């Protein structure tokens, strides 16, 4: 709904970046600060949140706090309202699933960074 945080250290977006850490996601769409996830994966190869086996994982770029799709401009609640998902590309850029689908019909480059190209994220 609002501001993102890491379920392991419990730091919010501000505290995470304050000392050089990134916001990351797993393939299964679960979100952490980079260092908490680094240190869990030394200990076991399972997602802290959903216990899926995790091999790979990547940075996501959501700065501020309150997530929205840059293409339609709907915020978190309006997106789910109608059964769309929040989705990240491998390059860590976020869209609603409908807009990324439609955008990929025409281009198959990321709208945000143009990297040639994903999965749901749960926030």
């Amino acid at each position: 709904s609002g501001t993102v945080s890491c379920p392991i250290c419990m730091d919010g977006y501000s505290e995470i970046v304050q000392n050089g850490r990134l916001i990351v996601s797993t393939e299964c769409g679960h979100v952490f600060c980079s260092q908490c996830l680094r240190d869990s994966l030394k200990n076991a190869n399972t997602c802290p949140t959903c216990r899926k086996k995790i091999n790979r994982y990547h940075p996501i770029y959501i700065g501020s706090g309150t997530v929205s799709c840059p293409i339609c401009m709907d915020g978190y609640s309006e997106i789910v309202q109608n059964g769309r998902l929040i989705v990240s590309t491998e390059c860590g850029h976020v869209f609603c699933s409908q807009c990324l689908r439609d955008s990929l019909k025409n281009a198959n480059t990321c709208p945000t960074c143009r990297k040639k190209i994903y999965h749901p994220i749960y926030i």
Binding site: P7, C28, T49, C50
Partner: protein
Amino acid sequence: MQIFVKTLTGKTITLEVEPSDTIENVKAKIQDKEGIPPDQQRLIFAGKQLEDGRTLSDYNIQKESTLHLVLRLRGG
């Protein structure tokens, strides 16, 4: 009717349900929001671990009740 689920982080989500929904059906709605597969979810209410096959009605779970989510666990 609405019930609430206190998810793993402490955040509370609101689910639209019917007294006839099974605990499995409730888990499915939680999966959509949380990305946690049903096989890993346990739902706690009044201290007990709710069983998948049974309905909200069977457990007397009325509107505005709050279920508590934990991960799959096992006594050994």
